[PDB]
Design a protein around this ligand. Structure first.
Ligand SMILES: CC1[C@H](O)CC(=C/C=C2\CCC[C@@]3(C)[C@H]2CCCC[C@H]3[C@H](C)CCCC(C)(C)O)C[C@H]1O
Ligand SMILES: CC1[C@H](O)CC(=C/C=C2\CCC[C@@]3(C)[C@H]2CCCC[C@H]3[C@H](C)CCCC(C)(C)O)C[C@H]1O
Lengths: 10, 237, 237, 10
């Protein structure tokens, strides 16, 4: 659930 | 007179904007080129995707946004991203053209470009109007930045949980903006109201976009053309 | 002498290739531009995504592939897509450069370009070698096309269901290829064997790619750069 | 499950 956003938010 | 910590919030917010706004629009050569079917969907999909990463970088530097739980940070970004993109895009908007001049000649999007990206005038009319409204407010850099931060920290968005904590932040942001206008912006007796009405208009644009995006993403020949981050942020998950 | 329906299969297969192979490589200007981090990942992601749609268009025109259930057509495409792309890419490969010359100068990918797309030499060594092997076979157009169709119609792929029906098709394809070589290709006494060994090599390249792709897609800063169709075809769903 | 492939395959 939301893989990219979690990354971008460090 | 503005406060010390009030000034600290403006300083850290202006800096966040400078780190996440490329005044040279130079990374636009790295997108899928514009064409003029839905000829402009690839290039403008890449534009929005690029801008989402800038909006996340800006948010990550808003004082206290980082301290929210990761869920709440997602819920705020997922719902306000498009509004902060409409907000920051005022910087490249021009009353003189009624288009967005982003550096070079092929990166000037007038209204006919944006219809070729799968959107109707019932979104572009309220959008272009919004931009000349916001452009006529001649906002200081300090105010433009504060308005983005306040649009981000709204508790009344779908999925937020710490309504109280986010509401604290947002109120701390409007105290600064009200103080700044009143003390550093001559002839802004009504300006803060005009800015809060702009947030209202933004909610209306969000709805219209969310409706037209839903149509564009249920047909795979078009959603195909979108990027994974765009699908994620504008996806309903 | 070749049969009538055998000739019909070659005619319909050659045509499928002409409809799905742009000898002008002109749609390459529509990709995200090459750069030379993972500088070449965006452009080559767009290359593979483009090619997947050509491979689907080719498959849709293989006689009898259309009559398979939609599940089986997906299971064959999901597993052979990368092999048919390595196969068709021989057309732009050049022994003279050891690169893929796709029209213009910026669309010439040598081996150092492809490492900047997140792949190691343990994929590129067997890949470049494979291409000079296939290039040295001086295949007729009729044979190159038949080999792609036979790589697609393999029953021994993950997820296929009608192993018997797909096996019929594939055998009907190798009868044509064996007849064609024996009757229309002077000095091809060993060529059909050399081609079946090429399918074996392709399976090995598939594994290596599937391993390096799995690594590239578990880090979101890279999977971000991929397209939705690439994520879907190479996804494990 | 496989939205795009289903479309492309008519
Ligand atoms: C820094 C940089 C520069 O100032 C220029 C900017 C301009 C932004 C604009 C004006 C042109 C139109 C779009 C792109 C709009 C911002 C978003 C609303 C409408 C846009 C369109 C319809 C997207 C449809 C794609 C989707 C599938 C997501 O609906 C973005 C800004 O980030
Ligand atoms: C018509 C047209 C032209 O002939 C040119 C063609 C060349 C094809 C090549 C040579 C260059 C390297 C790639 C692209 C390779 C084909 C696929 C294997 C390796 C490629 C690379 C590593 C992709 C990594 C992206 C991913 C994330 C999916 O792993 C494609 C063909 O369709």
């Amino acid at each position: 659930k939301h893989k990219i956003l979690h990354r971008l938010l460090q | 007179m503005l406060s010390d910590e009030q000034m600290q919030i403006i300083n850290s917010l202006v800096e966040a904007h400078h780190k996440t706004y490329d005044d040279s629009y130079s990374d636009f050569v790295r997108f899928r080129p514009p064409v003029r079917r839905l000829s402009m969907l690839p290039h403008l999909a890449d534009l929005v995707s690029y801008s989402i990463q800038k909006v996340i970088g800006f948010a990550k530097m808003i004082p206290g946004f980082r301290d929210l739980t990761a869920e709440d940070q997602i819920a705020l970004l997922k719902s306000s991203a498009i509004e902060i993109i409409m907000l920051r895009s005022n910087q490249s908007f021009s009353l003189e053209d009624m288009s967005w001049s982003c550096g070079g000649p092929d990166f000037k999007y007038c209204i006919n470009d944006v219809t070729k990206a799968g959107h109707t005038l019932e979104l572009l009319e309220p959008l272009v109007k919004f931009q000349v409204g916001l452009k006529k407010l001649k906002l200081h850099e300090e105010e433009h930045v504060l308005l983005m931060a306040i649009c981000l920290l709204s508790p009344d968005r779908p999925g937020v949980q710490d309504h109280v904590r986010i509401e604290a932040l947002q109120d701390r942001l409007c105290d600064v903006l009200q103080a700044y206008i009143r003390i550093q912006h001559p002839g802004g007796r009504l300006l803060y109201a005009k800015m809060i009405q702009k947030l209202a208009d933004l909610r209306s644009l969000n709805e219209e976009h969310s409706k037209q995006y839903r149509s564009l993403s249920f047909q795979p020949e078009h959603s195909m053309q979108l990027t994974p981050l765009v699908l994620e942020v504008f996806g309903s998950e």
